[PDB]
Design a protein around this ligand. Sequence first.
Ligand SMILES: NC(=O)c1ccc[n+]([C@@H]2O[C@H](COP(=O)([O-])OP(=O)(O)OC[C@H]3O[C@@H](n4cnc5c(N)ncnc54)[C@H](O)[C@@H]3O)[C@@H](O)[C@H]2O)c1
Ligand SMILES: NC(=O)c1ccc[n+]([C@@H]2O[C@H](COP(=O)([O-])OP(=O)(O)OC[C@H]3O[C@@H](n4cnc5c(N)ncnc54)[C@H](O)[C@@H]3O)[C@@H](O)[C@H]2O)c1
Lengths: 254, 254
Amino acid sequence: MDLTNKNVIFVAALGGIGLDTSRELVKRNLKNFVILDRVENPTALAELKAINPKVNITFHTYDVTVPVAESKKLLKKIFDQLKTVDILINGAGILDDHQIERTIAINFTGLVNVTTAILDFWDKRKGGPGGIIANICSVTGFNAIHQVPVYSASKAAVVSFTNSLAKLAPITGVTAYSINPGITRTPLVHTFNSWLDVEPRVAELLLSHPTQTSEQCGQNFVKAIEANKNGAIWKLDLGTLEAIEWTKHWDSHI
Amino acid sequence: MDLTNKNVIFVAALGGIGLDTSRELVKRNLKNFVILDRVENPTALAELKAINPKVNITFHTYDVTVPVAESKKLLKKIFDQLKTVDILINGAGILDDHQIERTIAINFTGLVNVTTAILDFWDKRKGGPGGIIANICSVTGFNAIHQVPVYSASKAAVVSFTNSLAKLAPITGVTAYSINPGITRTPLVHTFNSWLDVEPRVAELLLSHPTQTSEQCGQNFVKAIEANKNGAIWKLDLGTLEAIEWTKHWDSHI
Ligand SMILES: NC(=O)c1ccc[n+]([C@@H]2O[C@H](COP(=O)([O-])OP(=O)(O)OC[C@H]3O[C@@H](n4cnc5c(N)ncnc54)[C@H](O)[C@@H]3O)[C@@H](O)[C@H]2O)c1
Ligand SMILES: NC(=O)c1ccc[n+]([C@@H]2O[C@H](COP(=O)([O-])OP(=O)(O)OC[C@H]3O[C@@H](n4cnc5c(N)ncnc54)[C@H](O)[C@@H]3O)[C@@H](O)[C@H]2O)c1
């Protein structure tokens, strides 16, 4: 994948991992870089624009928990302007096992819904050109932080969902891969809530082990995007980039 | 584990797999069998009651998609009468990838929320005796049926969540294991919707391959319950019972 001249939508581009990934993305000569995130960040937006004046950077206020109809409407506006979108990159995520419904709504349901919405424009069965989806999942989707069982379960859901998207590519025209960071120093893991307060010191304990910086994660993230491998399960841990092999425990035969 | 004289709550006891499991359970001489299900089935109720008049069987009309406070209210009703409950079986589930939110709400959020609610009565930190949770997940939670990616992801979530529950047992006193049937002939799989209609013949095709009966499933379900292995991931496929080993791709080190 050559990012020169591509159009990219990045949901949650201005978070910890998001901003460092965006800093790296705009170093490529993208045609359009469209940011979809909850809250504006003027400072971050100005910096990205400064990194590469050749890229047209736009921002839209966006919340993944809205109905699928509301997402399509935003996407229509974007596709109407750009005519083509090359990549959708999802990053939306919260870590707070006190908020059960909201964790599931954001990390799992919202991702499925944005995907379902963009399929309206990309599905080759509806006359679409196909597309690429990069989903930020998490190593916790392979093996949980059992102290945040709901967060970890929402991530196991999206690793699975992404794996299925990739297997559906020959039908839909939409390829997909997961981006699964290991522990990364951002405001996500600085202070957080465990389920039923099973471990009030969870953040302190987690961060008392090796971590990577969001800078290292961002670098490997854009590397994974350029590799552009349908069905890849990328592990971005301790500053390395590594594809993992999913174990075959069962098969539907279809 | 000896089921004799035990008090059991079975969410969704009267469906395909549920009824044949419920038959095998009542033959094991339970003291009380508490059924929580979305709709009444007087025929099934009458029959179960007759299989062992010794066993005290009650029924509550219950929908897993209510808030945790509502669930806690019903459980207080039940605990106040029974004093003790030994085992909770969470068996509620739908298969319909035209219903994204509801699939997720029922198969994932609902299971987490009943678990969360009962923990208020069982958590050893709260003066409770601990307990046992048996979660009906699915082989699709290991490897998807990719034509029902939402269903399969919702199952990957509960496999993970159950794995984490088990690891939290030294803290909460509540042990847990997953029951993962392979394809089993019930009203669930008679016919059903694929996501975005990617495969309109998904049921026809799936059912042209080997299956098991709900009777085979139910017999192996009680066998695993009697085995009482914390953190077990039981595969109940093609009339067999099998413990599978989860791959270690990553470690939180905590
Ligand atoms: N930090 C880590 O160690 C780590 C590890 C593995 C995976 N992840 C995942 O990477 C992603 C980014 O996390 P981060 O560490 O940069 O945390 P962060 O809190 O700094 O950023 C989270 C991002 O998600 C966005 N977001 C949250 N709720 C949203 C909503 N309702 N609608 C739209 N956007 C929303 C935020 O606005 C922000 O852009 C998340 O999916 C997270 O689960 C993080
Ligand atoms: N049949 C299979 O091949 C298969 C394979 C793996 C896992 N499973 C799982 O086994 C469980 C039972 O499925 P089944 O095959 O007996 O199908 P089924 O449709 O016969 O039974 C579904 C059960 O779930 C209950 N339920 C559904 N929605 C509910 C709600 N909102 N609140 C409370 N209860 C609700 C139903 O009343 C019923 O008791 C489900 O979790 C299903 O996902 C089935």
